[PDB]
Amino acid sequence: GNGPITFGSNYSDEAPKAAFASLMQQATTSTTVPVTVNTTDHNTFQNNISNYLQGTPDSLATWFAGYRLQFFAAQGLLTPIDDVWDKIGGTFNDAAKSLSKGLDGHYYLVPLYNYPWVVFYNKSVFQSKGYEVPASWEAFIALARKMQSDGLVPLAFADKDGWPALGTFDILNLRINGYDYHIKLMKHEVPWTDPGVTKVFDQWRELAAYQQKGANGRTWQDAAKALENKQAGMMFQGSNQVAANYSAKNLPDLDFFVFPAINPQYGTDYMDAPTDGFILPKKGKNAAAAKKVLQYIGTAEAEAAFLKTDHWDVGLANGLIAPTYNDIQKKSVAEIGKCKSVSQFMDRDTVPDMANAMIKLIQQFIDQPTPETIATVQKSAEDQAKTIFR
């Protein structure tokens, strides 16, 4: 199993595309397996994952862990990878293992890295403008009002990509309602008409007046650019996005704080911290060689190689002393590890059709964040949920 492999990739942005290419360079060197990467625009790759897997997919592919893995593993679209994990199993922890498995208990994913969803800011700006890190909702709101009166956009905000605003719902839910409630909702074991969801949208109505206007017309990269260019005070997203988008020259000025506490019952106990990894499509060619590349991917060595170029994510291997780490990465390890539990992200944690319904409903909330809209959102979400989860 040394013959050439094909690798489908959603790393279409410059910085993560380059990081992946560097991993494949090293993967070919050590395994001997020639690899040809086929890249597709990020969103359209996940938007067409079904036809992709059912058609003539590549030997291996970039994908996501948790429910977003299970949903397509359940369809028989993926080759199980228990043989690979027999070799690499000792390298990963229980949390990474359960995220890597289908509903059937079998492995389908090799994971590579983790990252946090947190509020990013520029240290020099907080310093020079006398902004203090906010521990609580009230302090957060006060700070955003101070930014506003300073002539700044308080929170840079983008939702043209559809998924980014799901992160705000997640974190509001996790802060107000907690983790167990959030996963219930994702599994539709609690309805979208539930008063806890109303509370989420109600909190968001206060937050919305400090979020960048025109957000439904904005790519997340342009939001991250406004932060990096100091036109905005902070931005809530994943480090995989914001810190990958920063110049390497500017990255040392980047820092974050976890989303402030709202409800003392849940403090800052929880966050979204997505794991990314790789699958082996059932209809891909050369599975023998592909597993050899996967076995390599699932090592500390490979994660270290990878993190010489990726400076924004955090490796998952147990022994990992990949000493490249900057301050963003170190704080990521610590703050993630502090959480009692970590969810993935809405579109990774629920049925894709349900996430797609929410993506649109939340865009419509962004444009008209009134109690009227919130009522329609809950009823529409709950109606579509009853169909999807039947």
Ligand SMILES: OC[C@H]1O[C@@H](O)[C@H](O)[C@@H](O)[C@H]1O
């Ligand atoms: O950070 C969370 C996001 O991660 C992205 O890479 C993915 O395209 C989104 O669908 C969402 O899961």
